[PDB]
Swiss-Prot record, chain A:
Source organism of this protein record: Homo sapiens
Protein name (record): DNA-directed RNA polymerase I subunit RPA43
Tissue: Widely expressed. Expressed in all fetal and adult tissues tested, with highest expression in fetal lung, liver, and kidney, and low expression in all adult tissues.
Its job: Component of RNA polymerase I (Pol I), a DNA-dependent RNA polymerase which synthesizes ribosomal RNA precursors using the four ribonucleoside triphosphates as substrates. Through its association with RRN3/TIF-IA may be involved in recruitment of Pol I to rDNA promoters.
Family: Belongs to the eukaryotic RPA43 RNA polymerase subunit family.
Subunit structure: Component of the RNA polymerase I (Pol I) complex consisting of 13 subunits: a ten-subunit catalytic core composed of POLR1A/RPA1, POLR1B/RPA2, POLR1C/RPAC1, POLR1D/RPAC2, POLR1H/RPA12, POLR2E/RPABC1, POLR2F/RPABC2, POLR2H/RPABC3, POLR2K/RPABC4 and POLR2L/RPABC5; a mobile stalk subunit POLR1F/RPA43 protruding from the core and additional subunits homologous to general transcription factors POLR1E/RPA49 and POLR1G/RPA34. Interacts with RRN3/TIF-IA.
Protein's cellular compartments: Nucleus, Nucleolus
Curated annotation (Swiss-Prot), chain B:
Species the sequence originates in: Homo sapiens (Human)
Entire protein: shown range: 1663 to 1719 of 1720
Gene: POLR1A
Full protein name: DNA-directed RNA polymerase I subunit RPA1
General function of this protein: Catalytic core component of RNA polymerase I (Pol I), a DNA-dependent RNA polymerase which synthesizes ribosomal RNA precursors using the four ribonucleoside triphosphates as substrates. Transcribes 47S pre-rRNAs from multicopy rRNA gene clusters, giving rise to 5.8S, 18S and 28S ribosomal RNAs. Pol I-mediated transcription cycle proceeds through transcription initiation, transcription elongation and transcription termination stages.
Lineage top rank: taxon: Eukaryota
Notes concerning its domains: The clamps form the DNA-binding cleft. The bridging helix crosses the cleft near the catalytic site and is thought to promote polymerase translocation by acting as a ratchet that moves the DNA-RNA hybrid through the active site.
Similarity comment text for this entry: Belongs to the RNA polymerase beta' chain family.
Subcellular location: Nucleus, Nucleolus; Chromosome
Disease: Acrofacial dysostosis, Cincinnati type: A form of acrofacial dysostosis, a group of disorders characterized by malformations of the craniofacial skeleton and, in some patients, the limbs. AFDCIN patients may also have structural cardiac defects and neurologic abnormalities including developmental delay, hypotonia, motor delay and seizures. AFDCIN inheritance is autosomal dominant.
UniProtKB/Swiss-Prot annotation, chain C:
Keyword set includes Lipid biosynthesis: no
Effect after changing Y10N: In a breast cancer sample; somatic mutation
Compartments reported by the entry: Nucleus; Nucleus, Nucleolus
Lineage: Eukaryota, Metazoa, Chordata, Craniata, Vertebrata
Protein name (record): DNA-directed RNA polymerases I, II, and III subunit RPABC2
Species whose genome carries this gene: Homo sapiens (Human)
UniProtKB/Swiss-Prot annotation, chain D:
Domain notes: The clamps form the DNA-binding cleft.
Compartment(s) of residence: Nucleus, Nucleolus; Chromosome
Noted disease: Acrofacial dysostosis, Cincinnati type: A form of acrofacial dysostosis, a group of disorders characterized by malformations of the craniofacial skeleton and, in some patients, the limbs. AFDCIN patients may also have structural cardiac defects and neurologic abnormalities including developmental delay, hypotonia, motor delay and seizures. AFDCIN inheritance is autosomal dominant.
Function: Catalytic core component of RNA polymerase I (Pol I), a DNA-dependent RNA polymerase which synthesizes ribosomal RNA precursors using the four ribonucleoside triphosphates as substrates. Transcribes 47S pre-rRNAs from multicopy rRNA gene clusters, giving rise to 5.8S, 18S and 28S ribosomal RNAs. Pol I-mediated transcription cycle proceeds through transcription initiation, transcription elongation and transcription termination stages.
Residues of the full protein shown: 6 to 58 of 1720
The protein's name in its UniProt record: DNA-directed RNA polymerase I subunit RPA1
Annotated S-S bridges: none
Family: Belongs to the RNA polymerase beta' chain family.
Coiled-coil regions listed: none
Gene of this entry: POLR1A
Organism: Homo sapiens (Human)
Length: 157, 57, 76, 53
């Protein structure tokens, strides 16, 4: 189960426009800008910030107008990681690849299946000629985290 | 020479002797003089810069 | 708790400057401005009404500090 | 949006001579630095790995 919770401290610089309305502004752009976008600091899709609080006070720094402060936030995260056998939606069968929950996109480059199974253009048949186009074995351990629309490269061996 | 600021003391005179000294001694600078504060782009530690403002949340 | 109760002129200058730089960045003005376009005039209007939620953090020469409120400070 | 990070202290010491290495993009060997027409001669003082002048 991808269930994850990570308590992390972030640094956020709030504009003086969001003084009376901080909780509104602490999220408007400074936290809602990487909404479930791959994180490299901890390997995290940021689902949503459940709570964003400040321990005490804010430090306006000399000429700068912004108010800098610290945000202790729990990121509820879905972590499919190496060591897991996940599922995948089978929609389109290709030689290049085989493209969960309608939002997690997964990939399967060519030489990642059992080579005992030979393919036909319209649909592919596996060992015992049993057609499987459904949530089934998908074990991803090589993961892209760079491209805007990231990937989830799944395996079955 | 009896001064605790290498960045000062080299903005005055004989800057290369005071740099050689500060270098062979590992001399540390605290960025509290006006000269050391204007060399590294800080706000001087007197007059208007002597306190914080600490906007409360 | 031991420093002077009044607001030094340098503190007034920096507080006005910071409040003005805040007002100019679209901050709410708690002073009911009356047609003036200068953020510094507005900051003075706010300082005269005792509406500035800033905390002057006076530093002593050994690192120890004292946090005063701009409201709890005798403006001359 | 400024860097936000400030300096507390500056110390002057001597570089190891072995850490200056890896602080070096390439070794220069060609004496004549000015090209026939005024451009940078490769491997000279003015080079295109030591930055665009």
């Amino acid at each position: 189960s991808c269930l994850v919770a990570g308590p992390h401290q972030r640094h956020i610089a709030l504009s003086p426009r969001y003084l009376n309305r901080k909780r509104t502004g602490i999220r408007e752009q400074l936290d809602a800008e990487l909404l479930r976008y791959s994180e490299s600091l901890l390997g995290v899709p940021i689902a949503y910030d459940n709570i964003k609080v400040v321990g005490e006070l804010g430090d306006i720094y000399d000429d700068q107008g912004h108010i800098h402060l610290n945000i202790e936030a729990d990121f509820v995260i879905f972590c499919p990681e190496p060591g897991q056998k996940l599922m995948g939606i089978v929609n389109k069968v290709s030689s290049s690849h085989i493209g969960v929950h309608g939002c997690f996109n997964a990939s399967i480059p060519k030489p990642e299946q059992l080579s005992a199974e030979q393919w036909q253009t319209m649909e592919i048949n596996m060992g015992d000629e049993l057609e499987f186009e459904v949530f089934r074995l998908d074990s991803d351990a090589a993961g892209v985290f760079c491209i805007r629309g990231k990937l989830n490269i799944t395996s079955l061996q | 020479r009896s001064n605790s600021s290498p960045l000062q003391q080299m903005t005055f005179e004989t800057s290369f002797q005071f740099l050689k000294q500060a270098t062979m001694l590992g001399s540390h600078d605290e960025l509290r003089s006006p000269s050391a504060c204007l060399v590294v782009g800080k706000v001087v530690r007197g007059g208007t810069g002597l306190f914080e403002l600490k906007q409360p949340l | 708790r031991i420093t002077t109760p009044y607001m030094t002129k340098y503190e007034r200058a920096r507080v006005l400057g910071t409040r003005a730089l805040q007002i100019a960045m679209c901050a709410p003005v708690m002073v009911e401005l009356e047609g003036e376009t200068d953020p510094l005039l507005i900051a003075m209007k706010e300082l005269k009404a005792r509406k500035i939620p800033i905390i002057i953090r006076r530093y002593l020469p050994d690192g120890s500090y004292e946090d005063w409120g701009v409201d709890e400070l005798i403006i001359t | 949006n400024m860097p936000w990070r400030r300096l507390q202290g500056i110390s002057f010491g001597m570089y190891s001579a072995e850490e200056l290495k890896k602080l070096s993009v390439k070794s220069i060997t060609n004496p004549r630095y000015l090209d026939s027409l005024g451009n940078p001669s490769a491997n000279g003082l003015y080079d295109l790995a030591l930055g665009p002048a």
